[PDB]
From Swiss-Prot, chains A, B:
This is Matrix protein 2. Cytoplasmic tail plays an important role in virion assembly and morphogenesis. One of its GO terms (molecular function) is monoatomic ion channel activity. When the channel is activated, one or more imidazole moieties of His-13 probably become bi-protonated. The lineage of its organism: Viruses, Riboviria, Orthornavirae, Negarnaviricota, Polyploviricotina. The keyword Nuclease does not apply. The chain holds residues 25 to 46 of 97 of the full protein. The gene is M. The chain crosses the membrane at residues 1-19.
Length: 22, 22
């Protein structure tokens, strides 16, 4: 479960990074 | 890296739970 959580967090980071770029 | 991240999250949870108790 915490590996899944870490994976979700990594993807949230990517989303936020792309939103900041937009 | 995901194993390390998961482990850090687990330990942060423990730290926060203990602080909350105090
Ligand atoms: C404390 C409340 C503010 C929360 C800020 C969370 C951090 C924003 O997280 C995002 O992380 C990415 C790293 O992968 C960066 O590339 C983005 O620019 C940054 O917006
Ligand atoms: C799976 C969640 C990942 C984020 C990890 C770091 C933040 C955990 O935030 C939570 O804060 C509460 C104190 O108000 C504690 O009681 C919880 O035990 C702790 O898990």
């Amino acid at each position: 479960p915490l590996v899944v959580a870490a994976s979700i967090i990594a993807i949230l980071h990517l989303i936020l990074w792309e939103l900041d770029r937009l």
